[PDB]
Design a protein around this ligand. Structure first.
Ligand SMILES: [Zn+2]
Length: 257
């Protein structure tokens, strides 16, 4: 169907999803000199103490670590947000080479990968209703660079062998997403979209300034995943990132000077 290849990749998505050419598409390049420091932006509140991970799934485009979102167990508030948003899943985008893989860029710099922690606004009741609203989602984006290992990532890396191909899932309980955060919660924010079809313009993006470091071995394991299902020709799950889209009539704000 849509994907990341030569014949079905991002430049083709507008044919099935015309919002791909819309006014608030993501990702974008973050021009750090043009972003506006906004002193009215509050610190982010990340409350992940009671998070309940359940499962990890290869969906053919990335792998999602899924959470129980039927109660306020893992929530994001504050920052640019005016409500309570519940964590539903996180996943990554990454490259075939360490020099690319992120979706957002910073002064045109591409990082090796990018983590998206996806949350939905509880005033809309469920994720499927939230994506139909302009303030439905809050996505926390975190850049990954290759250097020292991230100890909190290793449990994810080690299960990937069990979900090599599209449609495979595995039990994945007791995973603590706090182990994926950098030290600082300084962030940029702007209004945008899902970065995969259906590309809905429902996201408040919150992109952290500080990257996390992961080891070369950790990202190598991401690159052993497959886009295909079992019993089909092997297509490595790499370069599953959408490039930067036009900023159009949007302002990126910074929580820091
Ligand atoms: Zn994503």
């Amino acid at each position: 169907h849509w994907g990341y290849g030569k014949h079905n990749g991002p430049e083709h998505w507008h044919k099935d999803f015309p919002i791909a050419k819309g006014e608030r598409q993501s990702p974008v390049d973050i021009d750090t000199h043009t972003a506006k420091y906004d002193p009215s932006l509050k610190p982010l509140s990340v409350s992940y103490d009671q998070a309940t991970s359940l499962r990890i799934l290869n969906n053919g485009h990335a792998f999602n670590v899924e959470f129980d979102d039927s109660q306020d167990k893992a929530v994001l508030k504050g920052g640019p947000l005016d409500g309570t948003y519940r964590l539903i899943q996180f996943h990554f985008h990454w490259g075939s080479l360490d020099g690319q893989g992120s979706e957002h860029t910073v002064d045109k710099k591409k990082y090796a990968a990018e983590l998206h922690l996806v949350h939905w606004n509880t005033k809309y009741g469920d994720f499927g209703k939230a994506v139909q609203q302009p303030d439905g989602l809050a996505v926390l984006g975190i850049f990954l660079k290759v250097g020292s290992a991230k100890p909190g990532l290793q449990k994810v890396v080690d299960v990937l062998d069990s979900i090599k191909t599209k449609g495979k899932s595995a039990d994945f309980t007791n995973f603590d997403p706090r182990g994926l955060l950098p030290e600082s919660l300084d962030y940029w924010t702007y209004p945008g979209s899902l970065t995969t079809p259906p590309l809905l313009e429902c996201v408040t993006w919150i992109v952290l300034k500080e990257p996390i470091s992961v080891s070369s071995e950790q990202v190598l394991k991401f690159r052993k995943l497959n886009f295909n299902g079992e019993g089909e020709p092997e297509e490595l799950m790499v370069d599953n990132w959408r490039p930067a889209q036009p900023l159009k009539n949007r302002q990126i704000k910074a929580s820091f000077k």
